[PDB]
Structure formats: C-alpha cells, structure tokens
Amino acid sequence: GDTIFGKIIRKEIPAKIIFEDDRCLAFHDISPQAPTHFLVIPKKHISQISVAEDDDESLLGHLMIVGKKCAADLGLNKGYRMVVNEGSDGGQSVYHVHLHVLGGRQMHWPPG
Amino acid sequence: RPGGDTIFGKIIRKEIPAKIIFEDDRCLAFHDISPQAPTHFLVIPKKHISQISVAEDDDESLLGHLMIVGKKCAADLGLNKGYRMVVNEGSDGGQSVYHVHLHVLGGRQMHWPPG
C-alpha cells in the first residue's frame, strides 16, 4: 500500500526537502514537535521497522548517518533526539519507515 | 580495556552486572535499570562510539544492526503491539552516558511528542 511518504518521494506533493540521495530523502515534518523536526526516510518501501530484513542493515544505518549530518547542517549543536516508531503502541503515523530527528529545544524524559 | 570505561563499556566486559537479552560480536542488548515503559531495554555497540554525532560513515552497518537487533529483541519479548526506538544526542537530546545506545520502549501506549 502506497502512503503519503511515497507521494513525497515521487515529488507528487510538496515537502520542504533538506537532503536527497539515491536511497533516502530528508524533509521537514509537516507537524513539527520541536523548533527543528525533520524525517529521514528510505526510498525503498519498508512499511515498518519490525519487517525490515537483515540486508537492510546498512540502509537503516544510512538513515541515521544522513540524519546526524542534516542535524549538524541545521545547527543542532546542543543535541537532538532520533525516534523510530513501530505499530500502534509506538505511535507510528505512516506505514513507511521513517526516522524522526527533533531538536532546538530541551527534549524531555520519558520520550512519550 | 576495549569499549571504554563508561558504565556501558564496563557492562560489555562483564565488570558491572546487567540483565542481558541478546549478545553478538557487534552489540549487546540489556534492560534499562530505570524503565520508562513496561519493557525498556537498550542496544549498544561493542565498539565505543561516544555519541551519534561523531559516528563515522563506515559505522552505517553497525548502527543499522542496532535497530535490527532491537526489533528482533522486541519480537522475542512479545511486544506485538509495537514499540518506540530512541537515540539521545547531547544535552538537548537528554543523553547521559557517552557510549551510543538505542532505547527500545514498549508494553504501553507511547505518546506524542516523544519528549
């Protein structure tokens, strides 16, 4: 099943794109929860982290490396929080794997 | 002493006890001593990386392995309704131990925003 993130990858609807390569896309979240809140998503349609394959390991790590590079480029020198939600208890909002990166304010504990 | 002398480096070398879920040559999963959810564990690399902001490009496979191990451990622990994975970076991220660690929290509804 296609999702709104598929439409964003395909450039069918607009998003504020931060970075793109051949295998992922980073863009600002439309409902930001911090002064900086962006997403890094694979172009491959992995619906949720629970179904990711072993062969996806380096791709998933690539999301985090891209995320940390984008965070530095966006000036998040005091830190940030990375989040992956899975399923209903995790609060996953779109069934396309996505890494949230939030910063620009103190993030609190517990993380939801 | 490989892994460093943070508490997580000590845990890797079995010098401080921990409730271990899974261990391989690249990482270790163990329960958090101050759980914020009914199930709350960590996955850490055995290689010492202080924080995600200093991870190297060649660390991609290892960082992805933390997530794959995290999701496998969550399934093994029966977290069939889902869970949240968290990496804290620096002061604004709430990081308190400078050895990279992926939190996995589940067994209750997680809320938004994530802190």
Side-chain angles (χ1 to χ4, degrees):
Chain A
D2 192 38
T3 74
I4 195 160
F5 289 174
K7 291 176 172 286
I8 288 170
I9 289 162
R10 294 192 305 271
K11 315 300 171 56
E12 292 168 2
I13 65 164
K16 312 163 184 297
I17 295 174
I18 296 160
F19 175 80
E20 187 171 359
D21 66 21
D22 61 341
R23 62 198 69 191
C24 73
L25 184 69
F27 57 95
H28 291 277
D29 195 297
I30 196 167
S31 185
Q33 303 297 305
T36 296
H37 179 180
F38 65 93
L39 304 178
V40 189
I41 76 174
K43 291 180 171 184
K44 180 179 182 180
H45 192 7
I46 307 172
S47 63
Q48 55 216 100
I49 194 67
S50 65
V51 306
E53 296 179 286
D54 292 20
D55 288 350
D56 296 312
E57 249 167 31
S58 69
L59 177 61
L60 293 172
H62 187 71
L63 307 179
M64 285 193 160
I65 292 299
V66 169
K68 75 95 168 177
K69 292 180 176 185
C70 289
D73 287 345
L74 291 167
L76 300 186
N77 50 34
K78 295 186 57 181
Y80 47 86
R81 173 167 295 160
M82 291 178 161
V83 182
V84 177
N85 295 333
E86 164 72 27
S88 72
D89 271 358
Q92 182 178 357
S93 63
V94 178
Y95 278 79
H96 186 120
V97 164
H98 52 286
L99 177 72
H100 296 264
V101 184
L102 306 99
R105 66 166 171 89
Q106 181 67 65
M107 305 301 298
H108 307 294
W109 205 245
Chain B
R1 288 178 304 265
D5 289 324
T6 68
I7 57 174
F8 294 166
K10 309 277 297 166
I11 287 175
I12 289 160
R13 294 191 305 275
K14 319 294 186 186
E15 296 164 2
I16 286 179
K19 302 305 296 180
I20 295 164
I21 299 156
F22 176 81
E23 180 164 1
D24 68 19
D25 58 291
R26 282 191 290 169
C27 74
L28 184 75
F30 58 96
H31 291 276
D32 196 295
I33 59 172
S34 295
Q36 301 297 296
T39 295
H40 180 179
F41 64 94
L42 300 183
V43 190
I44 69 174
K46 290 186 171 179
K47 176 183 176 177
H48 177 66
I49 303 171
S50 59
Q51 56 209 106
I52 192 70
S53 63
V54 306
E56 292 183 308
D57 287 5
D58 294 319
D59 289 322
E60 276 187 359
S61 291
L62 172 62
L63 296 173
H65 188 62
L66 303 184
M67 278 180 278
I68 293 299
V69 170
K71 73 95 171 181
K72 289 179 178 180
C73 288
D76 293 344
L77 295 167
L79 302 184
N80 52 48
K81 284 204 189 77
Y83 45 86
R84 172 165 299 157
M85 297 179 153
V86 181
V87 181
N88 294 333
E89 163 70 33
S91 185
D92 272 1
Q95 184 169 10
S96 62
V97 177
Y98 285 82
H99 179 106
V100 166
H101 43 292
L102 177 76
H103 295 263
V104 185
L105 304 98
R108 65 165 172 92
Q109 179 67 67
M110 304 300 294
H111 311 303
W112 207 241

